[PDB]
Design a binder for this molecule. Structure first.
Ligand code: A1AI7
Length: 164
């Protein structure tokens, strides 16, 4: 199962890890993707997850968008987890670099409550522009199901733990 995570709360756990490598090893029921509304998985967590599926995530995602249109900022959809997980929960956090309202980060984390356990990144952090310390605080104060957070950067992981 999940191993080497530091327990932060009753339901939130954290580890310095690449979420792609964690998903390949653990094969969780749900891996969260840090998606954008178009499901265009170019970089960050989305680009890395999609590359690990040999672009199968992007082919599925383009069919989903052709049928349904774009997601909302703060919204999500459940698609296949391909070779990484049973399911991928594509969740759109606000992108601060595009002036999206950071208050939508709590709505984005509420999607996690529909799943008993998830492997996830810190939403809206990284290339989405938000402060990761804030993202972890909104995660702990919003998600009630069991979440295993993979933080790619070691320096940031240590700062997140030491300021918790
Ligand atoms: O640690 S960071 O520099 C700042 C906090 C948010 C993460 C978001 N990206 C990722 N998080 C987890 N696993 C990943 N694999 N590929 C990308 C990625 C980036």
């Amino acid at each position: 199962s999940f191993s080497g995570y530091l327990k932060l709360t009753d339901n939130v756990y954290i580890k310095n890890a690449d979420i792609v490598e964690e998903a390949k090893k653990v094969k969780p029921t749900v891996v969260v993707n840090a998606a954008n509304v178009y499901l265009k998985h170019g970089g960050g967590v989305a680009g890395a997850l999609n590359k690990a599926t040999n672009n199968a995530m992007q082919v599925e995602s383009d069919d989903y968008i052709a049928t349904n249109g774009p997601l909302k900022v703060g919204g999500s959809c459940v698609l296949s987890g391909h070779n990484l997980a049973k399911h991928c929960l594509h969740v759109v956090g606000p992108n601060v670099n595009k002036g999206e309202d950071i208050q939508l980060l709590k709505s984005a984390y509420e999607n996690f409550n529909q799943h008993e356990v998830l492997l996830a990144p810190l939403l809206s952090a990284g290339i989405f522009g938000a402060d990761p310390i804030h993202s972890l605080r909104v995660c702990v104060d919003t998600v009630r199901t069991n979440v295993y957070l993979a933080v790619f950067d070691k320096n940031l992981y240590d700062k997140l733990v030491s300021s918790f």
